[PDB]
Amino acid sequence: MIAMVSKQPRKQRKARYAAPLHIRQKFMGARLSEALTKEYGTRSAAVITGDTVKVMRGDFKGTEGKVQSVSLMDGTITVDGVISTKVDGTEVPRPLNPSNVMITKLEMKDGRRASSIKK
Amino acid sequence: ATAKTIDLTGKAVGEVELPAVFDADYRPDLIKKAVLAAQANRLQPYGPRLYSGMETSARGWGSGRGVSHVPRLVNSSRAARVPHAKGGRRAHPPKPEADRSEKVNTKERRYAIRSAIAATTDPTLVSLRGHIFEAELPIVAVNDLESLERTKQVIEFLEAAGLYEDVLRAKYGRHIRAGRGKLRGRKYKHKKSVLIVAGENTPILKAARNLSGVDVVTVDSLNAELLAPGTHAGRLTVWTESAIGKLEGAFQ
Amino acid sequence: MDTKKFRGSRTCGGGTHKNRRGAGNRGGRGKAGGCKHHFVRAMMRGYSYGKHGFKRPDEVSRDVSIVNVGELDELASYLVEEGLAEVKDGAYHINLENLGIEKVLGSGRVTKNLVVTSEEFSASAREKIENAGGSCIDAE
RNA sequence: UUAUGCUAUCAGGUGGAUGGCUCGGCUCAAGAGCUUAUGAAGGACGUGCCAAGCUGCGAUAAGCCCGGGGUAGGUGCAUGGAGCCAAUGAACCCGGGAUUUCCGAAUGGGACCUCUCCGUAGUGAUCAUUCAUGAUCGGGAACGCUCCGAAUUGAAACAUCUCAGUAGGAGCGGGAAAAGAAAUCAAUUGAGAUGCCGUAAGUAACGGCGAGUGAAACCGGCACAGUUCAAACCGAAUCCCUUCGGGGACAUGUGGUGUUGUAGGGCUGUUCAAACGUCUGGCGGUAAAAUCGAACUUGCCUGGAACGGCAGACCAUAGAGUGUGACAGUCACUUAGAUGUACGCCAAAAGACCGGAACAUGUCCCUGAGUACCGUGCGUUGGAUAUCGUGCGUGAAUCUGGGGGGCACCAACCUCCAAAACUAAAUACUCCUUGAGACCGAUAGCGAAAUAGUAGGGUGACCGAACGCUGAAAAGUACCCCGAGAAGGGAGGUGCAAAGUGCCUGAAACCUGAUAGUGAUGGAACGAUACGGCAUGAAAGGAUCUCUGGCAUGAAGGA
RNA sequence: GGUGGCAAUGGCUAACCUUUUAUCUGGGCAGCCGAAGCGAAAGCAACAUGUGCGCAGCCUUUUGGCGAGGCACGACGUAU
Ligand SMILES: [Mg+2]
Ligand SMILES: [Mg+2]
Ligand SMILES: [Mg+2]
Ligand SMILES: [Mg+2]
Ligand SMILES: [Mg+2]
Ligand SMILES: [Mg+2]
Ligand SMILES: [Mg+2]
Ligand SMILES: [Mg+2]
């Protein structure tokens, strides 16, 4: 959250970069599928490690898969099948920004997830 | 003189007689004076700190050492406090106690504003300011425009009046400026398209508030900057009947 | 001054660079040296030495506000239009106590019958008022 | 094969300018404004699995517990190995607690000893008291009040003056403080507390009448507020503590009445009725994290990477922005707008509490003392014989009274009641909070884009830097060869691009090599002009342009 | 000084109110300057052209006429 109380770019970037962990939970959000937003009452939500998502921008457009990892600090999500191959040859997973992905399937292992999407 | 009243369909449905403010002469110089005065009056003081480069205790070494005579630190040779030493005070920097504001007398400022208002009727200057439109000036509208509460209705009215082209030009010519303006909060460089002047505070103020490059104001808050931004008269202004009826002695 | 004009001229319109140093290139600070080396400038600008006269206290001294009979005669109709005076029997009855003026001086001519009442009239103002058929009355 | 060299260009090294970016700085505005013996701020030392600096915390030691928000990851600046914590809801933010070593107001004694001695276990000093208990001590960016108090400098010297009641010092102190309800200002008749703002005004006034210094009243505004004691008369009618038994203060006066000027109050009588104020109350506002909040991520093209070009579809009380692998209203955070909100803050209705205002009355009573005033000295002031302060000396009167009305005294007239006391708001400042900017953009802006008052310097008071940038993603160079080698080099690969670990672009100075010209007979401001040799002349320069001739007209001149 | 506004029935407003957050619109007649000067002060108080010449300009038998501003007198206020 960064309001129009302040419109300066430096203030907004400082509020984003020094934002606490409870404000960085909202950084992980992404556009849902059309079906999910139609059946959940909100236009988007936050992506958790495990739910199937599809990267709709970048080198891995349309590659659905499972979010293997997420860091709240850097705001980076790593997708199964969206990786990089190093000089060693081992497949190191790639971090993609959560805005780049679009959620297709949810992950309802958390009973609190229903109240996290809305209200 | 007189104009026509155009309803929400865009067609002219009645002849309106313009007030005596509209038949004023064209004065680019007084328009420029009012514009520069308002832009100075909106300014803000700045300047360095009270002792920038000056809180040092440095003293010169005198002669006999082969170096220059500038002030240097008491325990090292590094120069300080002079405007040409590194880290030294800015010789002649801006002061926060400066008074950048200008002044125009109320009679000549009102004459400048009336000159700007007369310029809105003139098709040559309005089309000579980059405004792209096919309506016939002046664009006076019936007072139903005050009480429309959604920007789609504003879009329909501007399309009907032949003024949506300039709104589109404002939206899609709105372009990033160059230099240090972006970092200090001025990223985009904007355009002026449409000026709506309702008779009183109505929901059209919230309606066309989000139109790209479109300013809406009551007749009371009709400074000359709105009527002629950047010292150039010829803003594509949209009035109403209420603004016309509240304008007989606006600036005299 | 014009800073951008002298970028390159070194001295910036000052002649020698030994000019424009401090108070010595002006002959002291303020209006100093008015008896020794700025005597003629003191004469030219009014700084010349001396005291002359006295002052009465401002609480007792008073500067009256004046108006000439020509001004009253040639805009008395503007007084009757404005409401500061009226016309009785063809004689413009004008009181000075409400217009703020307290003395009347006979500069100019009088034509119409002005019934002027004021604090004090000059002798020629009285003469010019009474020649025209009007009258002067001292008002307390 | 001309070395040492010279000049111009090119490649590379050293280097870190320019350009671009920036979580920092500065300035202005708006809010809010004290904390500390219930042990602060500040400091020393400790504190992490591998932890050196900074930051946080204190032997429960980068933490512990509880209520609220948030919910899927967390384990600081600083995404390393191995573990740990978390769906018994952590991390994180708001609120309330716990722990909180030593010093420090530091306070049981003591400090060249941040520790040490006595332990009889700590209330050190000064104070109030019923000797139960309580107050003061230190810090706070500036502001506020009181007192003390220079010189440079200006006068073109310099002493009165100015600089200037400035700089500095001592005491006190809060969110504001001081001021404050006329012994006032006026002028012939008026106004009606104070502060601050504008103006009066560079005027009056002061002054080697030099330089300079320099108000107030009237008036227009911000904001509006009036009262309490001493005393007359009454006389313990009271006030504080408490174990509710009682104790203490007080007749050297607790308390009631009373509080002022065309005089007021008391005593005598009469008439009306009771204003403002104190307390209870919390209807309603305000109020913590925080909640919701529109509509594209559609086709082709280039691209590593689309926010872009060409087409296409929508939102706009919401086109302010920021991030996102490039220009984003429609991807995320958001934004206009609606919400929730404990403790606290304000708070009107509805009630209880004491009562206030006039009338007539008079040989009656009270109404602030080393005070008002005066002489003299000094400082200060614009204050001039006419500012205020206070050192010494003097020193009244009591309503049939006293003061003022810019030298004094007399008279008239006008105006007020001192020497006792309180009093919001308007105002001032910025540690802190938020916003904004024709501000700076890294040698600038704070000194510090903060492992910055740090490294470092000084015995000490104190002085005081430099250091920003990989890439979209580490994909941070596998394997092989040389090398003694975890150095380094080649080959090779990741990367659109080495941008190849202070790594973006990567200037010049300086250094190394190559190319062109010249060069071991040669004269110097390194160049200007003209003519030639050598090399280049792809782009951006010419194509009736370049070279060589004939013909026509040919000014000045003229064989 | 250059450019402008308003202009003897003059000009400007300052603080401040209005801010829908520093803009701006409408107010704000206190006050400053001009309007009468001379004089230390008390105090007194003037020309709304009486006259001559004459540029631009207009008219004109092209030499003259009228002539704003300009120049030179006359008259008047006050101090000595
Ligand atoms: Mg600096
Ligand atoms: Mg000279
Ligand atoms: Mg001097
Ligand atoms: Mg204290
Ligand atoms: Mg007081
Ligand atoms: Mg002084
Ligand atoms: Mg928006
Ligand atoms: Mg710096």
Side-chain angles (χ1 to χ4, degrees):
Chain A
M1 51 94 74
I2 290 154
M4 203 166 153
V5 286
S6 170
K7 70 162 201 58
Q8 293 180 356
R10 54 175 292 192
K11 279 186 170 69
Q12 296 186 357
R13 288 208 278 259
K14 181 189 174 180
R16 145 175 298 261
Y17 291 168
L21 291 163
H22 69 281
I23 307 297
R24 293 162 170 276
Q25 266 183 332
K26 274 180 296 300
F27 285 171
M28 314 316 301
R31 185 75 177 103
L32 303 191
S33 52
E34 326 293 351
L36 284 175
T37 177
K38 285 163 172 293
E39 70 182 1
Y40 272 102
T42 179
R43 203 186 190 238
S44 165
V47 179
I48 295 89
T49 301
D51 44 39
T52 297
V53 295
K54 167 177 48 184
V55 177
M56 60 193 180
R57 281 296 182 288
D59 265 327
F60 297 90
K61 282 172 292 294
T63 56
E64 305 98 4
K66 312 195 74 53
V67 189
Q68 289 300 110
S69 168
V70 160
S71 175
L72 281 173
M73 299 301 298
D74 291 289
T76 70
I77 70 165
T78 287
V79 165
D80 199 332
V82 166
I83 56 190
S84 47
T85 186
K86 86 164 310 174
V87 175
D88 298 335
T90 179
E91 313 292 347
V92 186
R94 173 172 292 178
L96 285 195
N97 201 237
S99 50
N100 305 137
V101 307
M102 185 185 64
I103 297 174
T104 52
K105 182 171 192 310
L106 273 183
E107 189 183 355
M108 310 294 297
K109 77 163 184 54
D110 201 325
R112 208 153 304 197
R113 178 94 169 95
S115 49
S116 174
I117 292 181
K118 205 153 181 190
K119 317 304 290 186
Chain B
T2 177
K4 294 188 176 182
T5 69
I6 51 172
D7 72 325
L8 289 176
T9 77
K11 301 297 185 309
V13 308
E15 296 287 3
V16 57
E17 169 65 6
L18 312 186
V21 59
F22 280 79
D23 54 352
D25 62 334
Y26 190 44
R27 283 302 293 267
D29 47 336
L30 292 179
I31 290 167
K32 175 189 171 182
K33 272 190 56 190
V35 168
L36 295 197
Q39 288 177 355
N41 270 308
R42 72 177 66 179
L43 288 165
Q44 183 163 355
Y46 50 87
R49 75 187 297 254
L50 169 52
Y51 286 104
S52 57
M54 294 180 62
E55 274 193 352
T56 180
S57 64
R59 39 170 185 256
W61 282 4
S63 54
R65 286 155 173 262
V67 301
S68 189
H69 274 180
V70 307
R72 297 166 192 267
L73 312 182
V74 307
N75 60 335
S76 67
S77 59
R78 191 195 65 77
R81 194 168 57 182
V82 287
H84 63 280
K86 178 190 157 303
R89 56 176 199 83
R90 173 71 46 171
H92 312 305
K95 287 89 172 183
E97 62 270 43
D99 195 19
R100 271 66 174 264
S101 72
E102 302 183 343
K103 169 183 188 185
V104 57
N105 307 143
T106 78
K107 272 185 157 62
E108 54 183 324
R109 174 182 57 71
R110 286 174 173 162
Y111 184 61
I113 301 182
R114 279 144 48 214
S115 177
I117 281 174
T120 69
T121 294
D122 181 75
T124 304
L125 294 148
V126 177
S127 71
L128 208 56
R129 199 196 150 289
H131 282 305
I132 303 299
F133 73 106
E134 202 60 20
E136 197 268 331
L137 307 185
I139 306 181
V140 176
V142 63
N143 286 320
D144 61 357
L145 198 76
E146 298 178 354
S147 179
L148 61 84
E149 322 165 13
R150 278 201 40 175
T151 188
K152 273 288 192 185
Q153 302 157 346
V154 184
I155 295 308
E156 299 179 356
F157 178 75
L158 288 174
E159 294 168 352
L163 285 81
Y164 191 77
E165 283 292 331
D166 197 29
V167 182
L168 267 192
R169 151 202 178 260
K171 175 179 171 175
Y172 293 132
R174 176 217 65 168
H175 204 189
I176 282 173
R177 67 172 65 249
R180 202 58 76 194
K182 311 174 299 294
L183 180 52
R184 308 259 188 74
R186 315 175 276 269
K187 183 182 187 189
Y188 307 117
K189 178 183 286 193
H190 289 236
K191 299 209 163 313
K192 306 316 271 189
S193 45
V194 171
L195 170 45
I196 295 91
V197 174
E200 83 284 356
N201 279 321
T202 79
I204 188 61
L205 298 171
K206 290 186 171 299
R209 201 174 52 185
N210 210 359
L211 266 298
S212 174
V214 171
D215 302 340
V216 61
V217 290
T218 52
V219 175
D220 301 336
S221 43
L222 202 66
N223 45 71
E225 297 267 8
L226 294 184
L227 297 167
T231 74
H232 304 303
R235 175 67 162 275
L236 184 76
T237 58
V238 175
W239 321 85
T240 71
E241 316 296 329
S242 55
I244 288 309
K246 207 176 302 300
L247 204 68
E248 198 53 32
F251 301 96
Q252 285 84 337
Chain C
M1 63 186 196
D2 197 356
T3 309
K4 192 178 287 183
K5 156 181 277 187
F6 297 128
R7 286 270 180 256
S9 63
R10 173 177 164 76
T11 43
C12 295
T16 306
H17 89 280
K18 314 198 173 191
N19 294 345
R20 304 188 160 171
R21 278 175 167 170
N25 293 156
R26 319 192 303 255
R29 306 212 188 210
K31 56 186 191 299
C35 187
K36 301 287 296 190
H37 63 100
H38 285 156
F39 191 88
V40 184
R41 155 173 281 171
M43 280 180 40
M44 292 188 159
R45 300 175 164 196
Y47 307 147
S48 190
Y49 283 6
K51 92 169 66 165
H52 174 61
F54 81 108
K55 311 276 185 47
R56 294 187 66 222
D58 208 303
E59 178 153 308
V60 288
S61 79
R62 55 195 185 87
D63 205 22
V64 285
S65 59
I66 61 172
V67 68
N68 301 285
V69 297
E71 308 177 21
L72 279 191
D73 190 15
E74 309 214 345
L75 58 84
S77 57
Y78 191 82
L79 274 296
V80 311
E81 176 183 0
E82 209 273 346
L84 289 166
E86 65 268 19
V87 190
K88 323 176 207 295
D89 67 77
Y92 284 74
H93 288 58
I94 296 181
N95 167 273
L96 269 294
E97 272 68 22
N98 51 0
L99 275 77
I101 304 97
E102 290 160 330
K103 194 162 187 181
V104 176
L105 316 180
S107 175
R109 321 175 316 250
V110 181
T111 56
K112 67 189 57 172
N113 193 302
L114 294 180
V115 171
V116 190
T117 176
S118 163
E119 289 83 346
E120 43 176 351
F121 297 86
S122 80
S124 195
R126 264 198 167 93
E127 295 158 359
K128 306 192 171 181
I129 289 185
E130 288 139 358
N131 291 344
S135 67
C136 302
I137 297 302
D138 294 332
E140 316 300 339

